[PDB]
């Protein structure tokens, strides 16, 4: 089961690390999504620090042990969103999503 | 993605939410359904591989839903039976990147727009 | 690292290396877009743009004009397996039906997944940048075939965009369609990382490959499919290092000669090289060049492996009495040599050669007794034979000595024939 | 392609390949003109032109600072011949009287023909473009020693014209004057086309070479003659593929072990690798490095050929009873291994390896019996030995099985010495 | 040169070559200053400077992701010694305390001498131009993250300064951190000249090395230490050719065969290859890879040398009767072949082959008798064995013939085993 | 090129035509004669290799003409005996690039301006 | 004996292929000569599509079987000339010329 | 760089001259003393290797001067005993490039500005 | 013992060779020092034609047999100085200086 901090805040232009924790991340990569309200989730990072094309170069990933984290450099106001991690469980068949982090930008 | 079939019904009935008009070649890609209860977090619903094998389900639905695909028309179906009140959610249609099923990747991309399914008294 | 000297046969076994075994191939198919370059012509004499356009057009057309001694056996099998796997899949992409399918996949976006008619699944990638420049900018700059325009910014820019394309041609043209390694230009760093991340193996292996991609790059190779329209199509075979962190050990040996009544008798072990154990069986990797080390990790190719019975480790323990036929070479004339090891050196030093060990603090420490001797990298920095000088491996570890009177001294040699090459030990001694 | 499996010796012979044999060398002597760059100097400090001129002027100086196991035997004579034939002509050009004769030939025009004093006739080519730029433009754009001039167009142009020159120096410097292959820079496509077209062979051969010029390019080499004034002189040796479309065949083998009261007896064929027939003689090509396949064509070097007698083909028909001394290796302990072949694979599978065949059609197909077995390309896509996996060559073609008792199961083995490396079959059996 | 034909064994010995022996390694440590390129960013879309800055930043980050058959025996020891000496020295440098020491040494000037904590002396060299450009010009030019400035001269200059840096990365990433040779980009001519002229040897050796730096460059190799801050640190490992102008000779052989009532017997000498004297000891250099000639000089690596007793020369005089065990291969199938030599060719042809010799004066001179014969390069320009032509070396030197009945026709051959791979002569004959 | 000796003569007589003042290294090239009767197509006449071996002729002249060369003066000569009225033609002097006789190349370059031997009544 | 069409015509700026046929072309190369009506022949193309210097990139050629062809691409006014193919006979000591195509440009 | 101890003394006495404030990492470089009588040519005086071994002297001084070094303070000394009237010279402090002692190089760079030592009645 | 001339003169703007001879030069490299009056000697050349950084490219040198030579190309006004050659003795343990050529520029 994946787990996340329910809320995090960052000072504008300061950096922040969201983190997602779960035993299965040792075997399977995470995917990171953001969800601004109403809109469908948009893939912002996957794997060990690969960005989809078009996602700005500020997002970067890191991971160790059984933990992953998404680092927002130079956090802009447009970074305020829900961030969800997901990964497969040790079956390899069932996907699980974290509870999502409601980040907010001051 | 022209997604349809989403409305409202009294519990204990059946409905189907189809996702079609794919811009990418729908064939050769695995597909998944993900749902979002109003304001709540995301839940994975079902999955299917590109040849139609490996239908699998979350335990919240393991007995009830069916996931089906047509590679000739380019359409994905999730057909719901014995619909229960907790099943009210936005349903999203999502794509699987993996080439090989043994791979380690576990993200989704190409998230469709939402298809709101409601269940009410 | 733990290194045992085996004086029963003048050999060392160094344990504790961690395997990295190639167990498959992964295929990415690239389309490189060079646009409508063959229409453009210059009516106005020599110029910067004409020279770069000429290079592009020339390079583009040039592609159309293109296309038991276990150590011997294993490397033949290895390269045969590699080439057939590559050609067998290339021959499946080369059809016009599939090239149009690949182009249809990639038409909207830069990465796509395709199943070939032959049932294999490939990643596909478009290197689109040059077509975009040739179409959107250069084509409108050259009005009316006047190439010698006043704006230099086009000329310098064009030299940058075609730079990658010309390098790809250069590597294929020099190799007749099958390159020896994945150049910087066949697959960039970003393209390589995004390719490895899709491989059919668990995250543990992939995390290692990403932190070690210079080895993944080195062992793969590329194949030219051809030039179709004005797109170059080529494919890259990437090694799946599907098994990691199994045990491995290396065996080294030197001539175990010894003497009676003024006649030497010699033995040298012929089973040198790498061994790795995997899921309960032992694989022997005899090729001189298909295992490579980087610290404790040794990178090896499973296709170069010869399976050996698990009892074969008994040649490292009590070779004098194991029933397994330990391969040895026998002879009458002693050879003097230094066989270096990860944690030391075997010195074989016999009649008429002078051998001594030295250090960087003091040049000479001792002169060695005759016969096989094990010099430890903690006890000397250098060892020298007959004015030759060798530098010992300074890596720290632990050493053991397994005592036992040498085989060549314990038995009496067979009277005829001596000088048997690569035979089982029973055939040389206790006749 | 027709592939026969020979049960008598666990070996496959694949017929129907078409020869391409190198039978001579052709020489083109280039002169590359740098012009009087050594007189130009700059007095403005750093600038674009100064650094390009420094590169050009420095590289021009650097050039002045360069002055019976039948496999190993064949590749020896092959390389000694190539290097010798090249040096013998370079030593003839290197005289001052000849370099002046060559440059006197090429004074009015870019290609000329000249007889060396040693009697060989060579094509000669002038690569003149850099001298034109240096003498006609750069030497007037600079005046006094103003070198950081305002026109950027001059500096960008210069970095193109000298680009070829620097690449030539690069390849010679890394190879001590003798390159391994003909880079695009030593001889460009147009120059290579004109060179090949002059070669001393009939039109049929030349048409083939023009469509395979990557392989001609790969198989030649170049020699630096020296720097003479501001001109580099170097020569390229091009392979004359004087014979084409003769028959060839490839022989593959695997350990033919057999069991007797719980002991083993083994045999391996050593007469392995490529054969081609030419004008009623058989030639054996034992190196791994020489012969290369492209479709049905095999590109081979007659300098590596060994003239095995006719009747040597009898080892492929009735090895048990031919009077030709078919070369085999003998021993007790069975190796298990997969030998690939163009249309299939041989699996040697003994003493407790696990062997099976499979396909991309779902699942594994069959666990194999022990003993030498032939798996056809049409039957399976993959074969696996003890967790290793091999992918079979997809090419379609006829297979035959030549039935017969394996020799290992038909004769009693010699009692001593039982293991023998490379011997006639009668040293091993029926003693 | 002098060349003797030894008809006792159908072999030639050519002598008078002058040695050049590698006897050590010399280390130069390079720091390549890239500068603060990982902060500079572009905010204004595609441009020239963004493309070159992207290439730079992309290379700097990707660079952080890396890291008895006497023949075969010799080459293993040789290559193991080379790589071990390099890794041992690199491991001293890779500590952060030493990288900061080297940089502190080089802070005010471009070359300095350092001692590593592990007791060794190294030269150190800083190549600094790219940091000078980045910190003093480009960083002020792209003032406000606006990279698409109007001045083109910045973009062209930047492509020149970063060029060396990009080439160094390219050669490491293709080789996983250990290059095969010292490219021009690892050391320029000036850097190589100052390095060689510091080496620990008397002036005579250096003057030769310094006029042959292309061969010094080829023999050495480089190792990546890492990327520290914004400096790439790598080291080069140069050969000390500490001994020159000792005597050397080369031995060549061809199969010597005879008949007795229509059944052949043959032997071939197995001690082919290079020999040299050094300080009164004889060294044998069996690896094909590890001796190379350039005219009268032969360049060899002392680590490949196996020491042989001085009596080994007796096999070149009276092989019939020497008590030294001359190595031969014996058998009964007469192979026909040509073996070239610096001043001639040995031609062996027997039943079913038609040797003949020819010249550029007239294509045919003489059909050869059956047997082993010595064709002097003064007597013919070419020899042809069967539809196949070899071209002789035109070097000039005296030849001798040492008359004598060949061994193959003087002794009765052993009855069993008649075929023996690599064995003392007395096992084959006079049983 | 200098070309000389072109003139009228009565049939049954003899004449000499020559080709000279070559700009290229005449000593190393084979040379050929090619003739053009007025308005008609071209006919090959004779040939010579660079060392003066391999004189060859077309059968219309095989018995009559002689082709000769002087590598010291740099001049090529064709001598005509028993001129017959069909021989009225412009005679061009032409160069053969072949490095080796057994090569497949078959073309000429370096055509001279030709001389008009006009045998007539 | 080489054989060739006596006359051919092409529309200005259209392409045209002149062809020359004879058995020996299968074994020896050919060369194509232009001839302006008053002037010595000038080599346009030789071998498997090689041009001398100066001869514009408009001229090109190709071969198959026992035929060779000269393709004038974008026929210009200056292309109106006789074109003569030549080769060698099956013996290789006698050269032979085809009766050149008179080409006219409309 | 500073150099000190320059002065004058009557013959038959002792003095010490020193070289200091090095800018080049004195610890790893061999060092040499080299002197110049007024208007005369240069003479080498003494030498020392980097670890303080191999103290060497010219025969003009071989029993008199002593060269020594302190790798912790970064100073170099030459002590003069029984000065004789011929020893009037400028003494320069000079640095040795050699990495290895058996190298072929022989020059010195980094010549200091020199200390005048006079001796006189 | 190294030896070289007492003095040499050069016509401005053309070459001059200073030469220094002594048996030991056969075996150890030389160094060439410039000394303008009063100032400390300054290294202008060492080894086989290697210049210290900052010494203008006019200075150059070469060697043959037991002799070494410094070639000043285009002798400028700033070249007037003493030049001192230097080597080790045959023992490789004592250094020696060749005396000095005073060079003057006319
Ligand atoms: C370098 O210098 C050379 C000569 O010193 C320059 O060559 C000149 O190039 C121009 C074209 O760029 C030629 O103009 C053209 O001439 C032809 C003649 O047939 C005509 O058809 C064209 O319409 C145009 O007028 C010019 O003739 C030529 N100079 C000479 C003496 O022939 C060259 O441009 C300079 N620059 C470079 C980068 O090489
Ligand atoms: C020239 O351009 C047209 C379209 O503008 C295209 O159809 C044609 O293929 C181009 N030329 C070549 C050689 O492809
Ligand atoms: C000694 O050899 C025998 C015979 O194979 C074997 O059974 C025994 O295990 C060996 N010794 C050890 C310690 O394994």
From TrEMBL, chains C, D, E:
Transmembrane residue ranges: 68-90, 221-244
Domain of life: Viruses
Membrane topology: Single-pass membrane protein; Single-pass type I membrane protein
Location within or outside the cell: Host cell membrane; Virion membrane
Keyword Iron-sulfur: no
One Pfam family of this chain: Fusion_gly
Keywords: Disulfide bond, Fusion of virus membrane with host cell membrane, Fusion of virus membrane with host membrane, Glycoprotein, Host cell membrane, Host membrane, Membrane, Signal, Transmembrane, Transmembrane helix, Viral envelope protein, Viral penetration into host cytoplasm, Virion, Virus entry into host cell
Similarity comment: Belongs to the paramyxoviruses fusion glycoprotein family.
Protein name: Fusion glycoprotein F0
Organism: human metapneumovirus
A GO biological process held by the record: fusion of virus membrane with host plasma membrane
GO cellular component, one term: viral envelope
Major location (coarse): host cell
InterPro entries recorded: Fusion_F0_Paramyxovir (IPR000776)
